[PDB]
Design a protein around this ligand. Structure first.
Ligand SMILES: CCc1cnn2c(NCc3ccc[n+](O)c3)cc(N3CCCC[C@H]3CCO)nc12
Lengths: 65, 279, 286
């Protein structure tokens, strides 16, 4: 019974969020502050903050109680 | 995340009628408990609502001048705790003056805003003896507050969604020249939205988007295309209509909001202090 | 209340755990911040490989937390010299750990206390990440953390160099250490201090350089170490296959940005290759 990766399927009830590894290609990172060299050395990138912000903006936008 | 959060699952209600039902039920259960335990000393549910609004402004004022600077997320969490607590409890049973401080205390803990208890109560404008008494009251009511929140402590606020929408507009909506011009006014609307019951009725993302679009409308800018094209709602016009209805309802909630009057609140405060002194 | 105390499971640094009717109850500053952290995080999470907070109650300044009762943990498995850890068992443990971690990181939470005893196992062989008393949400620039997190043996070098800002790399490095402990049956990098921890890391894996970690020297507590060549992984892990060695290399990459995420680790060929992961019912019981 070989394992096969399947992505997590959680309904966000909102618009599609662009992939983490595409934000820079799409120009989103031009509107977040750059991660400092110490931040990058620790593994924090501005792409993380941008992705979290977009995910929160789009989460449950279409949801109705 | 909001889309599978406790806030969405248990603390976003279908209508203002449900919230009014919960508040009237809380008032009536306190009335029945007091009558069984032991007159016109009771406050009416609309009087409870007026006092709750007044003490929410007082909680906001306490959090604004709180040193060290309390982050906006902690303040939003505290105000949400206050609203949720007085959905199911009467100000006649638990004084909102202490409950609001307890909400700030618990929110500081939950949002990892590290403040010592003595430096928490040092922000009070009261005497050191009153400060120790207030601290003991807060410690007494902390567990009660957590129980009445049903141990649902994470509060999703509209601030990060607001930032995410600003990023998305700057990236995908060149029609809007500088989206940052929309910040201040949208922030203004955000504050007003916070005074209503919207935080119990709409998603943080909906609140943020409503604030942004109201700011654009005040500026005269039309961003219908952002909803239609960038958010791709042209593929599901029903989704666009539902979103527009949600934002219109939130704008209506804001416009109808009645700030508490000073004299009415003073009379109600005398009434509530009388209710607490007795029994 | 509605739970009758059955057995005294043990005591922790923050509370004491009792088996009750079957669940585990973990019974001037007010409510303990660690208990509140566990409450606030586990109420927002629901995944088979994350410990479930079933109920919560308290009195005065004390609070109790109800969890599912877990039969054992990974530490008991590893240290049980009578248990054989086949490649399939190791793959199963790694898979469940990584699935829980992927769900956790998707909800922007770092565990920050990953180690074999914090990976509990129920009687069905389901592994669950537990002990969220150090877990914290990540992804906000304005939200600094402390480097003194994660048990020292499992602490990533960025943490040891004082990283206040970090991401999923801390958990993934701890995951690599857990994998190495699974393979070697002993702690991989048993330092006695932070300096000795970094020394063991660099002596085993090589001293990192600028090309492996471009901003390494910018970390606040950065200390230059002797240029150890390191030990090639196939020498350390003799029985590891090439795919497993690729996974281990990915988990132990010095640059935390290059270090593989839980998702990337799950997509690696090691997990889709033969033999398949052991089913939970067949995992060894200590
Ligand atoms: C709090 C959640 C929980 C669920 N089950 N469980 C258990 N089950 C028994 C057990 C587990 C692992 C290994 N062995 O041999 C027995 C123990 C325990 N705690 C007390 C005893 C030492 C561990 C410590 C862990 C703290 O989370 N906590 C829990």
């Amino acid at each position: 019974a070989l394992y096969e990766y399947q992505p997590l399927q959680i309904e966000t009830y909102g618009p599609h969020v662009p992939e983490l590894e595409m934000l820079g290609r799409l120009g989103y990172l031009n509107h977040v502050r750059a991660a400092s060299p110490q931040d990058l050395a620790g593994g924090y990138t501005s792409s993380l903050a941008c992705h979290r912000a977009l995910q929160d903006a789009f989460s449950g936008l279409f949801w109705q109680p | 995340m909001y889309h599978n959060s406790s806030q969405k699952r248990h603390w976003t209600f279908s209508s203002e009628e449900q919230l009014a039902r919960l508040r009237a039920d809380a008032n009536r259960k306190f009335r029945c408990k007091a009558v069984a335990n032991g007159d016109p000393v009771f406050l009416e549910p609309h009087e409870e609502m007026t006092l709750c609004k007044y003490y929410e402004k007082r909680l906001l004022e306490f959090c604004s001048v709180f040193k060290p600077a309390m982050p906006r997320s902690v303040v939003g969490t505290a105000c949400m705790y206050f609203k949720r607590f007085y959905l199911n409890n009467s100000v006649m049973e638990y004084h909102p003056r202490i409950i609001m401080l307890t909400c700030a205390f618990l929110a500081c803990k939950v949002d990892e805003f590290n403040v010592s208890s003595p430096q928490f109560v040092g922000n009070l404008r009261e005497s050191p003896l009153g400060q120790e008494k207030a601290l003991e009251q807060i410690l007494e009511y902390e567990l009660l507050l957590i129980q009445q929140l049903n141990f649902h402590l994470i509060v999703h606020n509209p601030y990060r969604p607001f930032e995410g929408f600003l990023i998305d507009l700057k990236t995908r909506y060149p029609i809007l020249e500088n989206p940052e011009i929309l910040r201040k006014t949208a922030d203004d609307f955000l504050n007003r939205i916070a005074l209503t019951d919207a935080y119990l009725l709409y998603t943080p993302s909906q609140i943020a988007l409503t604030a942004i679009l109201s700011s654009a409308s005040r500026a005269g800018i039309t961003m219908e295309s952002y909803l239609s094209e960038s958010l791709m709602l042209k593929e599901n016009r029903t989704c666009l209509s539902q979103l527009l209805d949600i934002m219109k309802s939130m704008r209506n909630l804001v416009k109808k909001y009645e700030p508490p009057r000073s004299e009415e609140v003073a009379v109600l405060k005398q009434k509530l202090e009388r209710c607490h002194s007795a029994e | 209340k509605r739970y009758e105390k059955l057995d005294f499971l043990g005591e922790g640094q923050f509370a004491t755990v009792y088996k009750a009717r079957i669940v585990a109850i973990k019974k001037k500053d007010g409510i303990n911040r660690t208990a509140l952290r566990e409450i606030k995080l586990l109420q927002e999470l629901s995944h088979p490989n994350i410990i479930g907070l079933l109920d919560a109650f308290g009195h005065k300044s004390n609070i109790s937390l109800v969890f599912d009762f877990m039969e054992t943990d990974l530490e008991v498995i590893i240290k049980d010299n009578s248990l054989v850890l086949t490649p399939s068992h190791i793959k199963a443990y790694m898979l469940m750990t990584l699935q829980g971690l992927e769900y956790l990181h998707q909800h922007w939470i770092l565990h920050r206390d990953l180690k074999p005893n914090n990976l509990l196992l129920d009687e069905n062989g389901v592994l669950k990440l537990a002990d969220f008393g150090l877990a914290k949400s990540f992804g906000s620039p304005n939200r600094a953390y402390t480097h003194q997190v994660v048990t020292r043996w499992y602490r990533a070098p960025e943490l040891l160099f004082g990283a206040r800002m970090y991401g999923v790399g801390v958990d993934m490095w701890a995951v690599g250490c857990i994998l190495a402990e699974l393979l070697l049956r002993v702690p991989f990098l048993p330092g006695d201090s932070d300096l000795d921890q970094l020394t063991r890391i660099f002596e085993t894996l090589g001293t990192p350089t600028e090309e492996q970690w471009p901003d390494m020297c910018s970390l606040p507590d950065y200390v230059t170490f002797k240029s150890f060549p390191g030990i090639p992984l196939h020498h350390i892990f003799s029985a590891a296959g090439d795919d497993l060695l690729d996974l281990i290399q990915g988990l132990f990459l010095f640059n935390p940005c290059a270090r593989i995420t839980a998702t990337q680790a799950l997509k690696m060929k090691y997990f889709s290759n033969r033999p398949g992961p052991t089913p939970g019912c067949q995992l060894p019981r200590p």
